[PDB]
Amino acid sequence: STEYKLVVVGADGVGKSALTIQLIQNHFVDEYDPTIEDSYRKQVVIDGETCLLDILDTAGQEEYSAMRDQYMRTGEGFLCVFAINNTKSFEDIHHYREQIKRVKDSEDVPMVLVGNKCDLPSRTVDTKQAQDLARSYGIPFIETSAKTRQGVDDAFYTLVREIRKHKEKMSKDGKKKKKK
Ligand SMILES: Nc1nc2c(ncn2[C@@H]2O[C@H](COP(=O)(O)OP(=O)(O)OP(O)(O)=S)[C@@H](O)[C@H]2O)c(=O)[nH]1
Ligand SMILES: [Mg+2]
């Protein structure tokens, strides 16, 4: 019943498309297929509510600062994905977060930090640093492997939960109005 607009963001090659295709299609693309902009719908039951997910799988490839704006205005929550063997992709999260906060003109934007490719050896981004970054941001951190499907549903369902929490918070706000 309730629709949630989710946007999967992050550097090229982190696994945004692999995560999203696991969620929607239940298989893993070993392939490379760089994304311009694909979207997907899926009907899910999360905490006993039916949810219509409308998911945008974005381009990691850059230039943008053109393209990012409209889908940042549109998105209700953001899956901020880095790959655990890609230091720059982790560092990129700060910049995506800043951009989203600026473009949506809010300090309060539902987000989940996703460390993908946890099936691989010799990670270059430690779990502790990701956890520490998420704690700073006051957002969940979930480790995934699109290859094995580990954590995939949890990552997307947790983002829906963050949106719901935000919706409830915004009704009560901090002040000005109040509600519940
Ligand atoms: N080992 C491993 N490989 C993965 C995982 N997720 C994605 N990959 C691989 O990484 C490569 C890039 O994945 P892809 O999903 O296309 O990245 P992207 O983030 O969507 O990249 P883009 O569209 O912005 S350019 C592919 O070869 C894919 O199979 C994972 O969890 N584990
Ligand atoms: Mg892609």
What CATH number is associated with residue 99? Answer: 3.40.50.300
Q: Closest by alpha carbon to 57, among 15, 106, 109? A: 15
Structure tokens at 133: 């970054």
Dist CA 138 CA 128 (whole Å): 15
Q: Method used for this model? A: X-ray
Q: Closest by alpha carbon to 100, among 92, 109, 91? A: 109
Dist CA 81 CA 84 (whole Å): 10
What phi and psi values does residue 101 have, to the nearest 5 degrees? -60, -35
Sign of CA dihedral 114, 12, 129, 116: positive
CA distances for 92 relative to 1, 87, 100, 150, 176, angstroms? 34, 9, 12, 23, 35
Domains in the chain: how many in total? 1
Hunting for tokens 């580990």 — which residue is that?
150
Q: Closest by alpha carbon to 97, among 88, 87, 107? A: 107
Q: How many CB atoms lie within 10 A of CB 174?
A: 9
Q: Which residues span the domain enclosing 77?
A: 1-180
Asked if residues 75 and 56 have their Cβ atoms less than 8 Å apart, the reply is yes
Q: Near ion ligand 2, which residues have CB within 5 Å? A: 16-17, 35
Structure tokens at 103: 């473009």
CA distances for 144 relative to 106, 166, 178, angstroms? 28, 24, 37
What phi and psi values does residue 163 have, to the nearest 5 degrees? -65, -45
Q: Closest by alpha carbon to 111, among 10, 1, 2? A: 10
55 CA to centre of ligand 1 in angstroms? 17
Query: Which strands sit side by side in the sheet containing 77-83, from one edge to the other?
Result: 37-46, 49-58, 2-9, 77-83, 111-116, 141-143
Ligand nearest to the CA of 86: 1
- At a CB cut-off of 8 Å and minimum separation 6, what does 167 contact? none
Q: From start to end of the chain, where are the E strands?
A: 2-9, 37-46, 49-58, 77-83, 111-116, 141-143
- At a CB cut-off of 8 Å and minimum separation 6, what does 112 contact? 77, 78, 79, 80, 139, 140, 141, 142, 155, 158, 159, 162
For residue 152 and ligand 1, the question of a CB distance below 6 A is answered with no
